[PDB]
Design an enzyme around this catalytic site. Sequence first.
Site, mmCIF file in Angstrom:
data_model
loop_
_atom_site.group_PDB
_atom_site.id
_atom_site.type_symbol
_atom_site.label_atom_id
_atom_site.label_comp_id
_atom_site.label_asym_id
_atom_site.label_seq_id
_atom_site.Cartn_x
_atom_site.Cartn_y
_atom_site.Cartn_z
ATOM 1 N N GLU A 92 0.835 -1.171 0.000
ATOM 2 C CA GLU A 92 0.000 0.000 0.000
ATOM 3 C C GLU A 92 0.892 1.251 0.000
ATOM 4 O O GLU A 92 1.758 1.369 0.856
ATOM 5 C CB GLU A 92 -0.861 -0.087 1.257
ATOM 6 C CG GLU A 92 -1.624 1.154 1.645
ATOM 7 C CD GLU A 92 -2.150 1.060 3.051
ATOM 8 O OE1 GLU A 92 -1.849 2.005 3.823
ATOM 9 O OE2 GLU A 92 -2.828 0.051 3.389
ATOM 10 N N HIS A 127 -4.028 -5.656 10.368
ATOM 11 C CA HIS A 127 -4.781 -6.720 9.722
ATOM 12 C C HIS A 127 -4.583 -8.070 10.464
ATOM 13 O O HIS A 127 -3.962 -8.989 9.941
ATOM 14 C CB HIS A 127 -4.290 -6.916 8.282
ATOM 15 C CG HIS A 127 -4.257 -5.695 7.421
ATOM 16 N ND1 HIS A 127 -3.502 -5.688 6.261
ATOM 17 C CD2 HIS A 127 -4.856 -4.479 7.519
ATOM 18 C CE1 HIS A 127 -3.616 -4.492 5.715
ATOM 19 N NE2 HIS A 127 -4.433 -3.752 6.444
ATOM 20 N N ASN A 151 -5.168 -6.291 1.486
ATOM 21 C CA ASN A 151 -5.970 -5.793 2.603
ATOM 22 C C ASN A 151 -7.181 -6.726 2.774
ATOM 23 O O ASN A 151 -7.798 -7.082 1.788
ATOM 24 C CB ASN A 151 -6.407 -4.363 2.309
ATOM 25 C CG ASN A 151 -5.251 -3.449 1.967
ATOM 26 O OD1 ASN A 151 -4.673 -3.565 0.891
ATOM 27 N ND2 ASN A 151 -4.915 -2.540 2.865
HETATM 28 C C1 LIG Z 1 -5.730 1.537 10.951
HETATM 29 C C2 LIG Z 1 -6.348 0.416 10.167
HETATM 30 C C3 LIG Z 1 -6.348 0.449 8.780
HETATM 31 C C4 LIG Z 1 -6.912 -0.616 8.010
HETATM 32 C C5 LIG Z 1 -7.438 -1.698 8.631
HETATM 33 C C6 LIG Z 1 -7.537 -1.706 10.061
HETATM 34 C C7 LIG Z 1 -7.000 -0.662 10.807
HETATM 35 C C8 LIG Z 1 -7.087 -0.738 12.308
HETATM 36 N N1 LIG Z 1 -7.937 -2.801 7.895
HETATM 37 C C9 LIG Z 1 -8.304 -4.077 8.511
HETATM 38 C C10 LIG Z 1 -9.825 -4.260 8.668
HETATM 39 O O1 LIG Z 1 -10.394 -3.088 9.226
HETATM 40 C C11 LIG Z 1 -10.078 -5.514 9.489
HETATM 41 O O2 LIG Z 1 -9.456 -6.589 8.838
HETATM 42 C C12 LIG Z 1 -11.574 -5.821 9.679
HETATM 43 O O3 LIG Z 1 -12.206 -4.707 10.272
HETATM 44 C C13 LIG Z 1 -11.768 -7.078 10.499
HETATM 45 O O4 LIG Z 1 -13.172 -7.393 10.525
HETATM 46 P P1 LIG Z 1 -13.744 -8.364 11.634
HETATM 47 O O5 LIG Z 1 -15.156 -8.584 11.333
HETATM 48 O O6 LIG Z 1 -12.854 -9.544 11.801
HETATM 49 O O7 LIG Z 1 -13.575 -7.552 13.007
HETATM 50 P P2 LIG Z 1 -13.642 -5.997 13.458
HETATM 51 O O8 LIG Z 1 -12.397 -5.711 14.220
HETATM 52 O O9 LIG Z 1 -13.947 -5.142 12.296
HETATM 53 O O10 LIG Z 1 -14.911 -5.914 14.405
HETATM 54 C C14 LIG Z 1 -15.007 -6.565 15.689
HETATM 55 C C15 LIG Z 1 -16.023 -5.793 16.489
HETATM 56 O O11 LIG Z 1 -16.350 -6.615 17.646
HETATM 57 C C16 LIG Z 1 -16.360 -5.742 18.830
HETATM 58 N N2 LIG Z 1 -16.059 -6.581 19.962
HETATM 59 C C17 LIG Z 1 -14.876 -7.201 20.205
HETATM 60 N N3 LIG Z 1 -14.931 -8.002 21.298
HETATM 61 C C18 LIG Z 1 -16.253 -7.864 21.744
HETATM 62 C C19 LIG Z 1 -16.927 -8.429 22.813
HETATM 63 N N4 LIG Z 1 -16.328 -9.320 23.669
HETATM 64 N N5 LIG Z 1 -18.206 -8.074 23.036
HETATM 65 C C20 LIG Z 1 -18.764 -7.203 22.192
HETATM 66 N N6 LIG Z 1 -18.226 -6.611 21.112
HETATM 67 C C21 LIG Z 1 -16.954 -6.974 20.902
HETATM 68 C C22 LIG Z 1 -15.363 -4.679 18.481
HETATM 69 O O12 LIG Z 1 -15.477 -3.530 19.335
HETATM 70 C C23 LIG Z 1 -15.598 -4.433 17.027
HETATM 71 O O13 LIG Z 1 -16.546 -3.400 16.752
HETATM 72 C C24 LIG Z 1 -8.024 -2.653 6.530
HETATM 73 N N7 LIG Z 1 -8.559 -3.726 5.867
HETATM 74 C C25 LIG Z 1 -8.776 -3.567 4.544
HETATM 75 O O14 LIG Z 1 -9.190 -4.540 3.815
HETATM 76 N N8 LIG Z 1 -8.585 -2.350 3.929
HETATM 77 C C26 LIG Z 1 -7.997 -1.290 4.557
HETATM 78 O O15 LIG Z 1 -7.781 -0.192 3.894
HETATM 79 C C27 LIG Z 1 -7.614 -1.503 5.921
HETATM 80 N N9 LIG Z 1 -6.972 -0.435 6.603
#
Ligand SMILES: Cc1cc2c(cc1C)N(C[C@H](O)[C@H](O)[C@H](O)COP(=O)(O)OP(=O)(O)OC[C@H]1O[C@@H](n3cnc4c(N)ncnc43)[C@H](O)[C@@H]1O)c1[nH]c(=O)[nH]c(=O)c1N2
Length: 498
Positions: free
Chosen positions: A353, A439, A477
């Site tokens: 990226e 990620h 990503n």
């Molecule tokens: C800074 C940055 C930048 C990027 C990215 C991430 C970050 C942090 N990503 C990665 C991408 O955002 C990530 O892979 C996905 O959001 C993961 O999706 P999930 O459904 O696995 O979990 P995700 O993390 O999205 O969601 C989990 C949710 O569950 C909640 N939660 C957790 N434990 C809990 C509990 N015990 N009880 C209740 N709620 C709970 C959390 O608070 C959260 O809202 C990315 N990817 C990509 O393809 N393109 C991109 O451009 C980027 N860029």
Amino acid sequence: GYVPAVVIGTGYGAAVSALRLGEAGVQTLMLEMGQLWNQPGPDGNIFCGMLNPDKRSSWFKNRTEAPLGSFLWLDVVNRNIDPYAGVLDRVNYDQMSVYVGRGVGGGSLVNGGMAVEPKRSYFEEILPRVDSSEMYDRYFPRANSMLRVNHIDTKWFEDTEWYKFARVSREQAGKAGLGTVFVPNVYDFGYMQREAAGEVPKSALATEVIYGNNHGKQSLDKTYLAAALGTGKVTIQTLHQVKTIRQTKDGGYALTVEQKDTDGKLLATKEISCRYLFLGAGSLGSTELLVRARDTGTLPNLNSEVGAGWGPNGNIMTARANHMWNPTGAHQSSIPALGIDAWDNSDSSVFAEIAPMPAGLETWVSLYLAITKNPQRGTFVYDAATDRAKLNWTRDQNAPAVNAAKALFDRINKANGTIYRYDLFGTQLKAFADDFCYHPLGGCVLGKATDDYGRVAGYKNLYVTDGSLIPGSVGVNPFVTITALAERNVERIIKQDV
Ligand SMILES: Cc1cc2c(cc1C)N(C[C@H](O)[C@H](O)[C@H](O)COP(=O)(O)OP(=O)(O)OC[C@H]1O[C@@H](n3cnc4c(N)ncnc43)[C@H](O)[C@@H]1O)c1[nH]c(=O)[nH]c(=O)c1N2
């Protein structure tokens, strides 16, 4: 109380699952530990920007942080803050820091929007038990449409000051014989044009992304979750964190759930039960719930693969110093548009990226998030003392990822007579940041901890839906893969189980 289906979390896996459950007529409750991000804050905006971070930037931290790569310029805006239910959480393990979103929409709130399918040949390598034709013919297209993926206008891209940083890296890579690709996004690129023209409120073009975008970005609250709520069968309870999961005597599931306020004060502890339980708490959150349940005896029939197979998607950050005649611009869109595609499925693979710098003045820096192929994996091990999953990853496990990133960027430096920056990631001379992850992938791997549709081994009507399913790496990503796999999985589960 009881509800037919519960979904834990509101990220990609969760949001897909809840939409399809609601469309099938299954009453579904989503439990999200973070906030619904819809209240204007002290500046009139929902989210803080990168140049004005405040408590909204951070999940229960006492000081703001500069975005990785940007400390030299953005430390000046850091401030002490109250611990608060903010949007971005840096989760610190012994030798790895993982960044995750906290709120309705999960990481979709804070991510860069890059919406990219993995190479089919690599998908087939990492998940050989999955029918790849259905993924590429049906589920990937469905995900792209639902997510509102769109494409930048190439003429605008070529002309705008906001993407000069991307064009510079394209030219430099080209001199080394390396090509770039446009990367689709969920940020509305038509809206982004209108920002540049002064026609609509800026967000990407006002140094916003990693603490949320006040405009432009189609996070999941606008897409899957809005649709799920529209079915009439889905509700979402916020500031509700699931702590424990057990199986009731008649084969349903019961949860202990803490309700907090935005200061983190415990308001209530509730018991919620269900027939069907879907985990969408992320690689970190879903895995922690299941290792806890196994190792505290509440889901004693979980297998040994629960916790295993974690990797950081080969994430490595690095940066190059440009010649003085190749400025990258004071004005850099916060949403990436280009990647360097050097991914051939070999151990030297890199998909990088080309990341924007939010300094707002000229630095001559090009910043890159490299995605590499590194077979090392970590394991989440339950610590009963502190009641936490502890990821056992060591920094030396990222050596292969560093090596691959360095080999690629060394080619670019050689072709251009440039050098790395060594000062962007702390005082120690360090050109490659090797102990963070944006990620996180794995912990409850598809076909290892679960069957090939995320049914948790040892249990009926218990499902994992999210990045914990992915075996450590997708070469791009990850959110499009998570979304498409979730579409596949929930469709099958509803057909066969519900
Ligand atoms: C800074 C940055 C930048 C990027 C990215 C991430 C970050 C942090 N990503 C990665 C991408 O955002 C990530 O892979 C996905 O959001 C993961 O999706 P999930 O459904 O696995 O979990 P995700 O993390 O999205 O969601 C989990 C949710 O569950 C909640 N939660 C957790 N434990 C809990 C509990 N015990 N009880 C209740 N709620 C709970 C959390 O608070 C959260 O809202 C990315 N990817 C990509 O393809 N393109 C991109 O451009 C980027 N860029």
